[PDB]
Amino acid sequence: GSSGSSGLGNEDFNSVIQQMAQGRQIEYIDIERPSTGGLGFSVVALRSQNLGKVDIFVKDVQPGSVADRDQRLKENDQILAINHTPLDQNISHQQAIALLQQTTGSLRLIVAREPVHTKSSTSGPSSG
């Protein structure tokens, strides 16, 4: 369905994000939009199950570009909102991409991450 209002109602920007994350730890990845460069990362569109919507995930995180050398954007990071705008059922996968290809100077991305649970994922820093 479609609706139009001035602001928010039952569900606010803080609620929508908290609902899409599902408790998952949310992180604000602030990226500095370069002048002679780009985000340095790609995104994938995958229709979710919750409801007519698309889940944008950060793929091909060029390990060395601003996204990294500058920010700490991780791969497979489901973007909940972009520049103060959630990609809920309201916004499709396309719109999400625009906000990026459009948003200049500063580009914020609120992604979620799954917590730890008797996982014990072996991870260590490698020098070379």
Helix (H, G, I), strand (E, B) or coil at 5: coil
Report the C-alpha gap between 1 and 25 in whole angstroms. 29
Technique used to solve these coordinates: NMR
Delineate the domains of the chain, giving CATH numbers in brackets: 1-128 (2.30.42.10)
Q: Torsion angle, CA of 112/70/58/93, rounded to 10 degrees?
A: 90
Could you give the angle at the alpha carbon of 29 between the alpha carbons of 27 and 116, nearest 5°?
35
Query: Do the Cβ atoms of 66 and 39 come closer than 8 Å?
Result: yes
Q: 111 near 27, Cβ under 8 Å?
A: yes
CA angle 60, 49, 84 (to 5 degrees): 60
- CA atoms of 14 and 64, how far apart (whole Å): 32
Indicate the pairing of strand 42-47 with strand 54-59: antiparallel
